[PDB]
Amino acid sequence: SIFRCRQCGQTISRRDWLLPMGGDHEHVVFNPAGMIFRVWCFSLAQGLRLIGAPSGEFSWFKGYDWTIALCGQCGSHLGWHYEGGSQPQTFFGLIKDRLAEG
Numbered sequence: 666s667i668f669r670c671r672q673c674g675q676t677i678s679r680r681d682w683l684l685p686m687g688g689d690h691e692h693v694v695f696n697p698a699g700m701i702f703r704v705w706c707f708s709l710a711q712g713l714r715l716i717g718a719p720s721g722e723f724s725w726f727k728g729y730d731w732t733i734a735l736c737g738q739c740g741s742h743l744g745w746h747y748e749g750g751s752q753p754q755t756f757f758g759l760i761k762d763r764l765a766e767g
């Protein structure tokens with residue numbers, strides 16, 4: 666029901682806050698460093714620290730710019746905040762295997 670940071674237990678999100686972006690909350694993507702992530706889209710998240718300004722470079726989601734999302738408590742990379750788009754304007758893409766569910 667609740668998602669916490671797997672490393673430290675920081676409160677991050679909720680199953681209720683999952684967002685089906687393009688018809689599915691789960692998107693399997695790879696970055697240019699060939700790292701594969703199972704990304705769960707959330708309308709809402711808390712307890713993160715968004716670092717830097719947004720970038721569109723290699724964005725997996727058309728029309729959205731990303732900011733790196735760390736755990737605000739432990740600094741572990743938990744995913745990205747997406748902004749600059751439409752329906753919705755913003756959302757979170759969190760790496761499922763870096764969260765723990767209650």
Ligand SMILES: COc1ccc(C2=NO[C@@]3(CCC(=O)NC3=O)C2)c(OC)c1OC
Nearest residue numbers: 695696697698720722723724725726731745
């Ligand atoms: C030009 O320098 C980079 C900028 C962004 C990234 C990204 N890695 O993950 C990102 C972030 C989130 C996203 O929507 N898609 C990706 O692919 C961008 C990158 O790879 C490590 C870079 O090294 C080449």
Ligand SMILES: [Zn+2]
Nearest residue numbers: 670673736739
């Ligand atoms: Zn943490």
